[model samples]
Target: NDAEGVWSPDIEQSFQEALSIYPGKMYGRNELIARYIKLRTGKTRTRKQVSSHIQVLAR
Candidate 1:
């Protein structure tokens, strides 16, 4: 599940596009793990994964 006050189809699409670019990167793997953990443990470590990344905007 996403954070409260954050919902955008475009952002979702951007995530998908990032997945496509990396194609089996750790971020995608982390997403799967986060989803599974959420389902089984009722919690997600997505923030840890998100925090591991460096952000850069393409101009």
Candidate 2:
């Protein structure tokens, strides 16, 4: 994704790191768990999932 008209370096870095770790695996570890929950319970999550499970808060 891009910010304004320029590439977002932070997002690029995150993508690169995720690619290195998971490679072709789109849903890895935590992602698989979240996906399973969505499939079984018909509930999806985003950043809001963390707030529901943990007390720490962020935007």
Candidate 3:
């Protein structure tokens, strides 16, 4: 049950703000975002979903 834009603007803002404090752990990148997203919204996400958005952010 994968969905996009499931996060609200405030939640998105939380993540965008948190993104700056990124972790050096490559594999844990998604974990960080997922955790932050969860903390912000009580929603859960798969790494693949976060990776998709982060991939675009990288570009």
Give me the candidate number with maximum lDDT: 3
Candidate 3, residue 19: how far the Cα is off, in Å: 25
The C-alpha stretches of model 2 lying farther than 4 A from their native spots are 1-27, 47-59
Candidate 2, poorest ten consecutive residues by summed lDDT: 50-59
User: Ten residues in a row with the worst lDDT in model 1?
Assistant: 50-59
Write down the TM-score of every candidate.
0.33, 0.33, 0.47
Residue lDDT tens for model 3, 1-59: 43455776878889888887785567678878889999999999977899998889899
Residues 1-59, model 1: lDDT tens digits: 66643747778788888878876545456466668778998976784564464232221
Question: TM-score of the candidate numbered 1?
Answer: 0.33
lDDT minimum window of 10 residues, candidate 3: 1-10
> What is candidate 3's CA lDDT for residue 26?
71
Candidate lDDT (C-alpha), each: 0.64, 0.64, 0.82
Residue 46 error for model 3, in Å? 1.3
State residue 12's C-alpha deviation in candidate 2, in Å: 34
